[PDB]
Ligand binder design. Sequence first.
Ligand code: WHL
Length: 133
Amino acid sequence: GASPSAQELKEQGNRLFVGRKYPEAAACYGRAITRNPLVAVYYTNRALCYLKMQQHEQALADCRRALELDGQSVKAHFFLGQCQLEMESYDEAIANLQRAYSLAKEQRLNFGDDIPSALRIAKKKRWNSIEER
Ligand SMILES: *CC(=O)Nc1ccc(NC(=O)C*)cc1
C-alpha cells in the first residue's frame, strides 16, 4: 500500500510512454490529474497519448482543458493544432500552430524547426484538400 504523488505518476507515465504503452501511460497521467487537476502539463501529456491512439475527441478535450489552465501554453496550442489538422479542421489547426509559434518566440523557447515544419505541412495539406475536393 503506497499511493504515489502526482509527480511520481507523471514520471511513471513518461516511462510507459517511452515503452509505447500508451493506454497505460494515459491512465497514469489521468491519475496524476485526479491528484492535482490544476497542472496543465498533465493534460498535454495525456493528449499526446491519445494522439498516438487516434483518439481525437479525447485529445481535443485535454488540449482545451490545458488552455483553460495555461492560455499561453505553446504545447497545448501545438498539440491542439495537430489534433485539428488530423481531423481536417485545417483553418483552426493553422491558427493554433501560428499561436504556438508566436508564444514560443515571446517566451524565448527554442523548438528547432518543429513549429515552422508543422505550419508548412498544415498549409500544404489544407491546399491539397481543396485542390481535390
Ligand atoms: C519521457 C519521454 O521521453 N517522452 C517522449 C515524448 C515524445 C516523444 N516524441 C514523439 O512522440 C514524436 C518521445 C519521448
